[PDB]
Design a protein around this ligand. Structure first.
Ligand SMILES: O=C(Cn1ccc2c(O)nc(NCC3CC3)nc21)Nc1ccncc1Cl
Ligand SMILES: O=C(Cn1ccc2c(O)nc(NCC3CC3)nc21)Nc1ccncc1Cl
Lengths: 122, 122
């Protein structure tokens, strides 16, 4: 019965992305081959089954650097990181396969299913 | 021209609230009179001009405890903290004045304006 603020969640996410852009309170570096990306662990956990599984484990909770599998495409990862912080997914014919495979590795099932629909649409 | 995921931001916020409920990666305690509340600084900064101003300052960025003004009502604060993490604001005739005054202190202008509309509706 509470009052619903229909733009609040989008506003929060936008502000979290602004904090990331200024490196404010970021607490992890994700290394993907020759590239590095900083982020907030909480957002990663909220958006990815892989990062949720890593950081929920007290053994790994405090890691400040995560090295992803060497086969992961950094562009695919960057596209997905931007999606996590924006709700907008930059799928293109030239990147669909890299994005899909990266989303499978990151355990982002709804994104994977969207990639399958994109393939079906050709 | 990117694909928009219309529930993504709400899903992220829900998952951030789940992390708060499990005390995962919370990094501040807010003390309000005899009560304490743990939270993520990033969400606080995203939702409040007061917390944004505090934590953007490199002098205060790493504070782990914030003592709010002793006059702040803990119930009012709890209502607003829950709003930050849910997008739902529990306004009632019995709490409107405490919530409004607390939102003024927390520099949550859209909430303050909503409180004014609630008063206008009686
Ligand atoms: O749900 C998530 C992260 N997430 C986002 C998509 C996604 C996906 O497609 N698969 C998975 N598989 C892993 C697990 C356990 C559910 N996780 C995913 N995080 C979370 C869950 C509950 N409380 C707090 C948080 Cl942060
Ligand atoms: O905008 C915010 C937090 N917020 C939410 C409502 C609100 C409000 O009604 N007033 C204020 N006044 C303070 C300031 C400077 C704008 N802040 C507010 N945070 C933010 C801004 C830009 N980049 C990252 C983040 Cl996290």
């Amino acid at each position: 019965s509470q009052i619903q603020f229909t733009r609040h969640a989008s506003d929060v996410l936008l502000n979290l992305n602004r904090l990331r852009s200024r490196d404010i309170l970021t607490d992890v570096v994700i290394v993907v081959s020759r590239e590095q990306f900083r982020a907030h662990k909480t957002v990663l956990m909220a958006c990815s089954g892989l990062f949720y599984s890593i950081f929920t484990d007290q053994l790994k909770r405090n890691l400040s650097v995560i090295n992803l599998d060497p086969e992961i495409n950094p562009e695919g990862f960057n596209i997905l990181l931007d999606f996590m912080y924006t709700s907008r997914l930059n799928l293109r014919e030239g990147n669909i396969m890299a994005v899909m495979a990266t989303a499978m590795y990151l355990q982002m099932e709804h994104v994977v299913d969207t990639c399958r629909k994109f393939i079906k649409a050709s």
